């Protein structure tokens, strides 16, 4: 089991990207640095916020025994670099989606004959 | 206001509503608990009421604490009923399965040769029939359908019962040409043993001496005498009102 | 059989929804308007993108008219349901039925 202590990595309710806990206030509230992205044009923003614990899920730990705000922004942009909003099939144009569909569909016709 | 004096109720509510029975022949609806620790045996039978008489028996029953030295013996006069019990004949079997809605019947299997007395129950009016009742069933012996049937009964069943009829032609005073049919349960052993025991005995006659012996305790199920429509004084025992 | 084909044609091209009530208070009903839920639409902001779109109720067992047309007029509540208007008033017997959402806008006069 993980613990809620400075340097815990968390996700928020119905969200894909990671955020990090910075201070603990009481037995139910914390201060977090939060990452999010505008799907309108890839515009990111990272900012600090006070939150109740019933909206967050812990997943791991890092150090940050001593760091500045600009440093932790760096930690965060590295951490969630790989992640994405949506599966690309829904983002691409129609012909490209059909081309991707054919691959899967033909592969089944092979497998059902080969098995 | 409360009634002036106390008194008990008239008649028992355990028997209300007191309606007329549907037909004159009873099914045994409840059977004693099975026990796998004992041999295969039958649990019931059919009988006819003849009449009553009386007997004298000797007795020696007294309180265990009674201080009397002598082994006193005493005559007692008692009334008794006589029942006639000719041998029943076995003609088929039924298997049942347990479900969330109780016991349900899986299949029924009949003997190859059946008697005129039992076929007569299947028709309504005795003297007007083409008698084409069971005439096509014997093929099922040749086809192996019987052997497939026993397999299914043996594979999937919780309770097994035999079908037996009574030989009415032996009791002429009944004026009756149709046998009575009863379904009787087998207790003891496992399902396989029960089925083999049954198979050995289709078409044969079982005497009453198989089921009961002297000094045994038994339960008797029957329908009472009929008395027609009647008033409250006789039906529930209420008191007659003031004379004027 | 034309009915079997007309269904498959519609199934391939429309979103699906169900009719569940007339517009009503605790006491009175307003049968000129009906309430619909759409399959995967679950917020009021999501639902706003359908306002103006055509809807069709197809009923093959009917002897008079095989389909009724309508239009989505407004959002209703906070969980993505909508309000619609049809060329004829919907019967209480037709509640629970399947409705097709047609992916193009029409004017209030066309129905």
């Amino acid at each position: 089991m993980y613990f809620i202590k400075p340097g815990c990595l968390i996700k928020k309710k119905f969200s894909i990207y990671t955020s990090i806990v910075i201070s603990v206030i009481d037995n139910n509230s914390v201060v977090i640095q939060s990452y999010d992205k505008s799907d309108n044009g890839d515009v990111i923003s990272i900012d600090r916020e006070v939150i109740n614990v019933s909206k967050i899920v812990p997943i791991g730990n890092i150090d940050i025994k001593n760091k500045s705000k600009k440093e932790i922004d760096g930690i965060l942009v590295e951490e969630n670099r790989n992640l994405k909003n949506k599966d690309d099939v829904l983002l691409m144009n129609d012909f490209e989606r059909f081309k991707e569909q054919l691959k899967k569909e033909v592969e089944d016709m092979v497998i059902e004959e080969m098995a | 206001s409360c009634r002036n004096y106390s008194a008990p109720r008239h008649g028992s509510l355990a028997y209300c509503p007191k309606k007329r029975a549907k037909t004159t022949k009873p099914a045994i609806k409840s059977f004693p608990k099975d026990d796998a620790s004992k041999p295969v045996h039958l649990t019931g039978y059919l009988a006819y009421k003849v009449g009553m008489t009386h007997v004298v028996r000797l007795s020696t029953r007294r309180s265990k604490t009674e201080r009397v030295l002598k082994e006193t013996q005493k005559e007692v006069l008692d009334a008794v009923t006589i029942l006639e019990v000719p041998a029943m004949r076995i003609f088929g079997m039924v298997g049942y399965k347990s479900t969330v809605n109780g016991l349900k019947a899986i299949k029924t299997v009949y003997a190859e040769h059946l008697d005129e007395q039992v076929l007569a129950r299947l028709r309504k009016r005795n003297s007007r029939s083409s008698k084409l009742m069971f005439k096509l069933y014997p093929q099922k012996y040749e086809n192996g359908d019987i052997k497939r049937d026993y397999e299914l009964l043996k594979r999937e069943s919780d309770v097994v019962r035999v079908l037996a009829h009574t030989q009415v032609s032996k009791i002429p005073s009944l004026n009756l040409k149709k046998a009575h049919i009863l379904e009787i349960q087998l207790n003891g052993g496992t399902i396989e043993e029960k089925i083999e025991w049954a198979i050995e005995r289709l078409e044969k006659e079982i005497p009453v001496s198989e089921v009961f012996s002297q000094q045994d305790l038994i339960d008797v199920i029957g329908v009472t005498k009929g008395k027609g429509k009647e008033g409250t004084t006789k039906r529930f025992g209420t008191t007659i009102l003031q004379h004027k | 059989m034309e009915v079997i084909k007309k269904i498959e044609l519609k199934e391939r091209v429309c979103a699906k929804g169900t009719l569940y009530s007339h517009k009503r208070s605790k006491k009175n009903i307003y049968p000129r308007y009906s309430l619909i839920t759409i399959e995967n639409v679950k917020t009021r902001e999501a639902a706003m993108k359908y306002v103006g779109n055509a809807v069709e109720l197809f009923k093959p067992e009917s002897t008079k008219e095989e389909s009724i047309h309508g239009i989505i007029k407004a959002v209703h509540g906070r969980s993505g349901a909508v309000r619609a208007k049809f060329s004829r008033n919907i019967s209480p017997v037709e509640m629970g039925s399947k409705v097709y959402i047609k992916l193009y806008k029409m004017n209030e006069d066309e129905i």
């Binding site: 592969e107 080969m114 | 479900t99 969330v100 | 169900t18 569940y20 629970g96 039925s97």
Partner: protein, 198 residues
Amino acid sequence: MIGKRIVIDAIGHVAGKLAGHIAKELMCGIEVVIVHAENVMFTGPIKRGVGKFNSHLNKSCSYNPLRGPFHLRSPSMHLMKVIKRKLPHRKSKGQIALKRLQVFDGCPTEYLSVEKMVCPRDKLEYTTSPIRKSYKLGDLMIKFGWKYESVVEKMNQNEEQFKIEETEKQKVKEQKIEELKKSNKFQQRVEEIMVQMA
């Protein structure tokens, strides 16, 4: 929508909360099958449940008991009556809706293979605090004369057998196909069919 069916595994849900969600679907035309009715959970000690049920048996029609309430004694039928009174059952629309519902203790053989849904908002471990007691409907109903407990235990053992067999049967095909598809003999024909579709 009329023409849609749904199968629900009732284990671990709080009875009065699932019943509200189910009743809404029946009014929208769905056919619902509930499985495992004997495992639904009530909150609080069993002691309180026993008293609420005793007060219910006391209710009867004064002049004729064959008109009065019927006190049902099976977990399936009890949960059915909880759902019944969250619908408009005195009117035709509720009587139509009710006939779309079936409820079973255990899982019957015709529903072993079918894939099954669940309701996260109504599960005990979400909707209640850990520090307080609860009981199962199967535990209450043995005290008021239910007679088919053992029949349901025998059913539950058939389910376990089917689960292990199906999972074992699946894991072999997963391994087989995933090991197969890495081969050249497979990856060759991809090209052979595509030559005729490109």
